[PDB]
Paper text:
Ocr inhibits BREX defense by binding BrxX in vivo. 57% of the extracted particles yielded a 2.8 Å global resolution map (BrxX:Ocr) corresponding to a BrxX2:Ocr2 complex where two individual BrxX monomers interact with a dimer of Ocr via their TRDs and CTDs. The two BrxX monomers are oriented at an angle of 125° relative to each other; however, the complex displays imperfect symmetry due to the local flexibility of the individual components resulting in varied local resolution. We resolved one monomer to ~2.8 Å clearly defining all structural features except for a flexible loop between residues 395 and 420. The map resolution for the second BrxX monomer stretched from ~3.4 Å around the core of the particle to ~4–6 Å at the periphery; hence, we rigid-body fitted the first monomer model into the density of the second monomer (see “Methods”). Ocr is highly negatively charged, and its interaction with BrxX is largely driven by electrostatic contacts with the positively charged groove on the lower half of the BrxX monomer. To form direct contacts, Ocr utilizes two pairs of tyrosine and glutamic acid residues that form hydrogen bonds with four residues of BrxX TRD: T821, N823, T768, and the main-chain carbonyl of G721. Three out of four of these TRD residues are also directly involved in DNA recognition or binding: N823 directly interacts with the A4 in the target strand of the recognition site, while the main-chain amide of G721 interacts with the phosphate backbone of T5′ base in the non-target strand. Ocr is additionally stabilized by the BrxX CTD via a salt bridge between Ocr E67 and BrxX R1145; the latter residue also interacts with the DNA away from the recognition site. The DNA mimic protein Ocr exploits this non-specific DNA recognition property to sequester BrxX (Stage VI).
Anti-phage systems of the BREX (BacteRiophage EXclusion) superfamily rely on site-specific epigenetic DNA methylation to discriminate between the host and invading DNA. We demonstrate that in Type I BREX systems, defense and methylation require BREX site DNA binding by the BrxX (PglX) methyltransferase employing S-adenosyl methionine as a cofactor. We show that BrxX contains MTD and TRD homologous to those of Type IIL R-M enzymes, and, in addition, contains NTD, CTD, and insertion loop in the MTD specific to BrxX proteins. We show that BrxX alone does not methylate DNA, and BREX activity requires an assembly of a supramolecular BrxBCXZ immune complex.
Residue numbers in the entry:
A (entry chain C), C (entry chain D): 1 to 117
B (entry chain A): 1 to 406, 431 to 1205
The structure:
């Protein structure tokens, strides 16, 4: 009920898998198109259960201070701020290592192009 | 549900009753305004038709209505409205109970029609009910039966006829003659839309099967008014209203069996009722003298008609029913006619009184119902009843005794005068016995005038009977009293009541229950039994010491049961501790009291214990309680302790109370770190401006609690203007002992050196000029287990004062002196190892050498050695003397606790006990080290000499100290401002100087290992570990994040290093020493710290613009982000620069004497956490 | 450590005991002067360990929405906001029941006049 054990690593793995799914489905070919592909990948990664959110912030791998002042919601609820922090951390981590999947997909599609036939 | 239904139905029912009464009064012509002035309508009648609102009352009702106005002349409108509402409610409840019981003459329900809701069963049985109640109007009613209508007061007429029929044997509620309420009958009350149908539907059938519903109506129905009046103190209006409660039956039976049943058994041993009792307690052993005296005074046998029982607070009447049952059992044992027994019992065997008419009426109704269910010749003859009491006395004369057909005149006048102001004084009014018997004869004369003579004689007899009856009842000199006094709180303290108590006995005038107990003793004959219950808070107070002495001098104990807490199922009752006791009027010096301790037991467990009769301590005398001062009667204490208590002398006038201040402590008491040391008396003699003071804090033994300073300039002339108390201005500046007056947890005494002052909170003890006893011996004794247990026992309230300490015993020895000296030395050594004491010398980790881990291990070993030594000394001092007599086990873990900061249990909470203390503690130590480092940079501490170096005011004389050579190994800053950034641009960066400090202290061979150890130690508890970073980055992050909080917590919201911050983005942060702040500080900060930073930001902003443009790609997200970072910082720093210039244009001068609390709010929005320190939001210009 | 089980009830009990000790020490004899006492009692009651804060926020008794917009700190850290929320909740709960202690202390100290002797 009020007890849960979810770590940041599970969230990161889920986000990584969803990013791979998005880049495969949408047929991303350029780096600038990755932004949105990352954004959606983060959207379906932040938990909505309050217990899970509180357990994630106590895990290892996520800091407790914002880096950009433009990503803080102007609200009175504390769930939104924590969700925004998780979203920013996931965005940074995913964008840190993202060209690998893009170039792998590009080389694979080049291999199986079969002379455009 | 069943009980909650009455509670939830009472408020709306009462409101509806009051609204109906006031509406009918207004329609009649009686109106009341907000002020309460009468608004009687004009009695102008055109003739044979009264011009009211919408009603045409008969002219014969006009005079009776005037009586209501007459009532308005003698009593308030609200009082009569409430009385009428209660009368109607009681009558409807009585008739509903009677019709549900099915004991009517015709056996037909009146208000409720079976199998037909919202109707009357008598509607179909009109002729039978008519001939059963009013035959003369039967045929006319039959005519109404022919109409099939007229649901008007004709039904109320039948109800009045039923009441008149019941008046033959029940005259105290139903009257055959026309009543005042007959004129005020509510309009359409018989209609199905009235409140009668709501009463029928709301009240179920099952709840009528209970027998305690009378008490439910007595208590729950008035609970709303009690809740309404609990807010404000009542003086004379709600005296009985707020003193209504239900009493459990089992304690009532226990008291009754030990009051009259015990007396009945002791009267003659041949009573076969030995097996008929279950709560009776048989005494085990007594001295032969008291046994012979009891045998001599006890008559061989007495008639069963001589039993006298008084109940000053009958309340619901359960005690009356229990007494009636016991008397019936006794008479059946003796052998008597089963029908005359209730008559004789009500004649000369059961009596009672009260203050509320409602309680008396309910008790009478319950008694009559029980008699009807028991006797069969009742309800056909009639019998007088004694329930009401303390009725108001009318002043009408020359008419009451005119019809009397006349010594007794003077007595009648006196008793008429006495009963005038009877409501306020309650049941405490007494009448001399000599005027009783003749008065009783007067009552018989009234019985001879009740039916003999014309109507005027009967009216005079009815007016004169109640006061004579009340006087006779209160002057019966009963032999057994069983009642529970009501509870009086803050509202019970009245000015007139206090005046009456002063006129009465002042020994126990504090509370009303004690006065009730005293009066019950007074109204009890010789060799009587008084069984009562009360609260526990009557045996452990200084006020009741005289009362306890009087009780043990004039009476004796028989059986006391400590009910204690956990009563009534633990519902409400913040103070539920209670006791019960039975007292014999005969004085027994060497009696053997019996005590049962049922404390901290639930009701079921308490009943089980009472039935099983365990935990009995019949091992004490009656005069033994006189040995301990104050007579704190206790049963767990052994006789050896009592005997040994008086074998040792106690402290005399060596205890002296502290001085007192009348207020404005904010301008007198300040903490020591926030003042100059030149004006301090303990350091730097020459000026006597500030002096140490003692106030007492948490638990601490033999030393500590030195953290407050008072102003005592010129022996005191500034505070002498107020002249609060200036108590004992002769024993100051002398060594001795101190202890905390406040409760806290236990009792402890600490050493007090010279040059100190003591306040009211901390009281001081001084040795005499040439006394044999020594201070160290006193300190050794006062911390012993024996004295702790004695102090806990004497005053469980934990309010140790001067009067309660001048009786503690003290022993004499020789080793106790050296043991106390060693304990004091160890405690002082433990206390003087932190920065918060003015005897701090050096840190405990830099005095060793080698490795940082080696130093930490040495520190831990030192602390463990101190702890073990103190534990061994405590064990030795406990085993050395221990009175060399009997002793008890450890009372509490608090009484066997060692108070040291080294003891981790005492430091990190005594409740939690985990292995995490092995980590957190470590981290804390490292934090302290870092703080000391800053103390070296700011100039407060130095690595060459010991103690404080510079703590003066105004940054004057620092140049001389710097030139002399105080700071040579570790140079100190000259400006006095330490920047705090995330870059090494400045040469005053705190992290760089911390690294330099570490390298200087521990060499330059394993600097990296030391830095790694420090960084790892900080991340354990203080902050959160990160992914990957060097030690220096971790140190910088800790300094920028979790250093201000720790410093502000250490000094308790009185910071020494003030923080200047820019705002949301940490563009500029600085630390300023409070004692090195002159009037030219802000200008330097603006000049040589802010402008170069702005220039650097501007020069770095444009450079990154071209970097992003060149080689733009996947790194463009990583890049240009800093470009967004520097945009906000520039504008924020510009705004901060504008504010700083505005404030620096004004030369602000500060004074340390004012204090941080006031001086911290003179800089506007330039500091950090202004509201958290000053208490009010900052003001922006 | 991370596996910390600290609830809002413990914090409330500690704050209540501290408030009682403060009112006994200071000897305040008026109703409207309790603001300073309650402020002091509430300040020195919130924890500092981040794991303890995260375990308290997930306990039972404390909501997740601010009631006053003026108590919101202006910073980029998330621990401060949670601490402010806990402080406000404690202040409201303690101010709910504060007259009882004052009147009890007054009526208890009334019985120690000793007729000015
Ligand atoms: Mg400097």
């Amino acid at each position: 009920m009020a007890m849960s054990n979810m770590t940041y690593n599970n969230v990161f793995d889920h986000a990584y898998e969803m990013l791979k799914e998005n880049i495969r489905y949408d047929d991303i070919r350029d780096t600038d198109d990755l932004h949105d592909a990352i954004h959606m990948a983060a959207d379906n990664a932040v938990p909505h259960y309050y217990a899970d959110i509180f357990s994630v912030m106590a895990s290892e791998g996520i800091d407790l201070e914002f880096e950009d002042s433009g990503l803080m919601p102007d609200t009175k609820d504390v769930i939104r701020i924590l969700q925004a922090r998780i979203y920013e951390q996931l965005t940074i981590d995913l964008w840190e290592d993202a060209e690998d999947l893009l170039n792998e997909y590009l080389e694979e599609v080049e291999e199986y192009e079969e002379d455009e036939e | 549900m069943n009980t909650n239904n009455i509670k939830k139905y009472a408020p709306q029912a009462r409101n509806d009753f009051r609204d109906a009464v006031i509406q009918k009064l207004t329609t009649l012509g009686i109106a009341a305004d907000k002020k309460g002035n009468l608004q009687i309508a004009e009695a102008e009648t055109i003739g044979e038709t009264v011009r009211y609102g919408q009603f045409d009352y008969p002219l014969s009702t006009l005079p009776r209505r005037e009586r209501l106005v007459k009532r308005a002349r003698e009593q308030g409108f609200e009082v009569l409205v409430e009385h009428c509402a209660y009368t109607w409610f009681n009558r409807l409840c009585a008739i509903r109970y009677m019709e549900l019981h099915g004991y009517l003459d015709h056996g037909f329900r009146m208000l409720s029609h079976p199998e037909t809701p919202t109707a009357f069963e008598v509607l179909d049985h009109v002729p039978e009910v008519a001939e059963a109640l009013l035959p003369e109007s039967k045929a006319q009613l039959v005519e109404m039966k022919l109409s099939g209508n007229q649901d008007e007061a004709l039904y109320r007429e039948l109800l009045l006829g039923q009441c008149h029929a019941l008046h033959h044997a029940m005259p105290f509620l139903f009257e055959a003659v026309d009543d005042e309420a007959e004129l005020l009958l509510p309009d359409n009350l018989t209609r199905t839309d009235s409140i009668l149908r709501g009463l029928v539907d709301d009240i179920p059938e099952e709840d009528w099967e209970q027998v305690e519903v009378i008490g439910w109506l007595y208590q729950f129905y008035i609970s709303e008014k009690k809740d309404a009046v609990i807010g404000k103190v009542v003086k004379s209006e709600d005296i009985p209203a707020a003193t209504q409660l239900f009493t459990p039956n089992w304690i009532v039976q226990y008291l009754v069996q030990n009051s009259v049943g015990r007396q009945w058994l002791q009267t003659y041993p041949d009573s076969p009722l030995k097996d008929k009792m279950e709560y009776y307690i048989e005494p085990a052993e007594q001295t032969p003298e008291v046994q012979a005296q009891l045998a001599a005074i006890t008559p061989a046998s007495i008639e069963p008609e001589s039993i006298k029982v008084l109940d000053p607070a009958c309340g619901s009447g359960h005690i009356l029913t229990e007494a009636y049952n016991v008397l019936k059992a006794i008479y059946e044992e003796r052998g008597y006619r089963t029908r005359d027994i209730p008559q004789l019992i009500l004649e000369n065997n059961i009596f009672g009184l009260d203050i509320d008419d409602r309680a008396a009426q309910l008790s009478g109704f319950a008694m009559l119902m029980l008699a009807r269910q028991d006797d069969r010749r009742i309800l056909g003859r009639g019998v007088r009843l004694n329930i009401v009491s303390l009725q108001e006395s009318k002043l009408d004369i020359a008419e009451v005794w005119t019809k009397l057909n006349f010594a007794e005149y003077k007595l009648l006048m006196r008793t008429l005068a006495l009963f005038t102001s009877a409501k306020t004084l309650g049941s405490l009014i007494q009448v001399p016995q000599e005027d009783e018997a003749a008065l009783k004869a007067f009552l018989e004369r009234l019985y001879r005038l009740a039916v003999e003579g014309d109507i005027q004689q009967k009216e005079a007899a009815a007016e004169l009977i109640p006061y004579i009856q009340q006087a006779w009842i209160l002057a019966q000199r009963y032999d057994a009293v069983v009642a529970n006094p009501p509870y009086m709180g803050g509202k019970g303290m009245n000015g007139d009541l206090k005046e009456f108590a002063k006129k009465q006995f002042p020994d126990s005038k504090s509370d009303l229950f004690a006065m009730f107990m005293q009066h019950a003793f007074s109204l009890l004959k010789e060799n009587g039994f008084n069984a009562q219950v009360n609260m526990q808070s009557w045996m452990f107070l200084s006020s009741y010491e005289a009362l306890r002495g009087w009780l043990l001098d004039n009476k004796t104990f028989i059986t006391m049961a400590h009910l204690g807490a956990r009563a009534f199922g633990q519902i409400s009752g913040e103070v539920v501790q209670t006791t019960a006791w039975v007292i014999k009027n005969n004085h027994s010096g060497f009696y053997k009291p019996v005590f049962f301790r049922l404390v901290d037991d639930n009701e079921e467990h308490k009943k089980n214990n009472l039935l099983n009769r365990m935990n009995c301590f019949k091992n004490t005398l009656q005069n033994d309680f006189k040995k301990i001062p104050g007579s704190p009667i206790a049963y767990w204490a052994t006789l050896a302790f009592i005997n040994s208590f008086l074998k040792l002398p106690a402290l005399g006038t060596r205890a002296v109370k502290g001085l007192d201040t009348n207020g404005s402590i904010d301008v007198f008491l300040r903490r020591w770190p926030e003042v100059s040391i030149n004006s301090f008396d303990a350091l730097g003699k020459g000026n006597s401006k500030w002096f140490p003071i003692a106030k007492g804090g948490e638990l601490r033994k033999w030393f500590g609690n030195h953290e407050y300073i008072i102003n005592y300039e010129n022996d005191g002339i500034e505070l002498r203007k107020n002249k609060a108390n200036l108590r004992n201005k002769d024993m100051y500046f002398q060594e001795g002992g101190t202890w905390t007056v406040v409760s806290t947890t236990g009792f402890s005494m600490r050493y007090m050196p010279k040059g100190f002052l003591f306040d009211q909170g901390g009281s001081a003890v001084f040795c005499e000029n040439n006394d044999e006893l020594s201070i160290y011996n006193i300190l050794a004794c006062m911390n012993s287990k024996y004295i702790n247990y004695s102090a806990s026992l004497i005053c469980p309230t934990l309010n140790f004062t001067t009067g309660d300490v001048r009786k503690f015993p003290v022993i004499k020895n020789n080793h106790l002196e050296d043991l106390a000296k060693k304990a004091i030395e160890i405690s002082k050594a433990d206390w003087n190892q932190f920065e918060t004491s003015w005897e701090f010398s050096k840190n405990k980790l830099i005095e060793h050498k080698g490795n940082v881990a080696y130093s930490y291990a040495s520190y831990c070993n030192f602390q463990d050695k101190l702890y073990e030594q103190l534990v061994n000394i405590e064990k030795n001092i406990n085993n050395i003397i221990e009175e060399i007599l009997g002793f008890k086990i450890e009372t509490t873990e608090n009484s066997e606790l060692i108070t040291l900061n080294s003891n981790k249990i005492y430091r990190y909470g005594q409740s939690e006990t985990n292995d995490t203390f092995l980590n957190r503690h470590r981290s804390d130590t490292i934090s302290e080290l870092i703080s000391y480092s800053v103390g070296c940079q700011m100039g407060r501490y130095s690595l060459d000499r010991e103690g404080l170096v510079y703590a003066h005011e105004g940054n004057k004389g620092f140049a001389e100290l710097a030139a002399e050579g105080a700071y040579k190994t570790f140079p100190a800053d000259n400006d006095g401002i330490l920047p705090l950034m995330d870059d090494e641009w400045f040469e005053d960066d705190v992290t760089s100087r911390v690294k330099e400090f570490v390298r200087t202290v521990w060499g330059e061979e394993h600097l990296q290992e030391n830095l790694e150890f420090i960084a790892e130690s900080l991340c354990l508890y203080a902050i959160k570990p990160k992914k990957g970073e060097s030690a220096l980055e971790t140190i910088r992050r800790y300094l920028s994040t979790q250093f201000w909080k720790d410093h502000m917590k250490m000094y308790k919201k009185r910071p020494i290093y003030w923080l200047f911050s820019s705002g949301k983005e940490k563009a500029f942060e600085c630390l300023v020493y409070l004692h090195r702040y002159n009037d030219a500080t802000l200008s330097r900060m603006r000049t040589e710290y802010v402008v170069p930073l702005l220039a650097r930001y501007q020069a770095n902003i444009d450079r990154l613009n071209d970097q992003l443009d060149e080689a733009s790609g996947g790194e463009a997200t990583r890049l240009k982000r800093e470009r967004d970072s520097l945009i906000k910082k520039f504008s924020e720093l510009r705004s901060y620069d504008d504010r700083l210039r505005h404030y620096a244009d004004m030369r602000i001068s500060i004074d340390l004497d004012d204090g941080v609390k006031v001086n911290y709010g003179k800089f506007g929005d330039l500091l950090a956490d202004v509201k958290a320190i000053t208490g009010n939001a900052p003001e922006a210009i």
